[model samples]
Target chain A: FVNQHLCGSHLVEALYLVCGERGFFYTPKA
Target chain B: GIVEQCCASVCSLYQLENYCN
Candidate 1:
């Protein structure tokens, strides 16, 4: 299963760091 | 490296949708 609460945020941040200019958006797991 | 592994799992789970591209 995906730890969308914790790791998802980290992955989101990592992706943003590497792909922020590519229009990647971040949304929380609700 | 549990955190890394966990993140990897999450990455796989989400199929690394929009990463670094």
Candidate 2:
């Protein structure tokens, strides 16, 4: 939640990295 | 509980399909 509140870019990047590690792909449109 | 506005928005807009299930 802290990330969701004030660290979304980091959160998005982490998600991207983690998800990509799992072979799923996504992009933060914002 | 009231919705966590930021969490909800992040979960929705931040590509949660990979992050969450």
Candidate 3:
């Protein structure tokens, strides 16, 4: 399931990039 | 379940806005 991992990892990277270092701030509402 | 929506929104928004598409 490498594709799943890639998709998930990419999603994480995107969240970090978009939300910045403090991305956790949006986790509750996100 | 929690992470799914975040990822779904991320993916959807990513695709819609074409930011990460």
Native contacts present in each candidate (fraction):
0.23, 0.09, 0.04
Local accuracy of candidate 2 as per-residue lDDT tens digits, A1-30: 333542446555555554555644333342
lDDT of 3 by residue, A1-30 (tens): 112322455655654565554443223243
Q: What C-alpha lDDT does candidate 3 achieve relative to the native structure?
A: 0.40
lDDT of 3 at B12: 47
C-alpha lDDT of all candidate models, in order: 0.47, 0.42, 0.40
Model 3 pairs whose backbones collide: none
What are the per-candidate TM-scores when only chain A is compared? 0.43, 0.42, 0.45
In candidate 3 the C-alpha lDDT for residue A19 amounts to 50
lDDT of 3 by residue, B1-21 (tens): 324544444334433122322
Model 2: CA > 4 A from native: A1-6, A21-30, B1-21
Task: Decide which is better by lDDT, 2 or 3.
Answer: 2
lDDT of 2 by residue, B1-21 (tens): 012433344334444443433
Candidate 2 vs candidate 3: the DockQ winner is: 3
Candidate 2 clashes: the total is 0
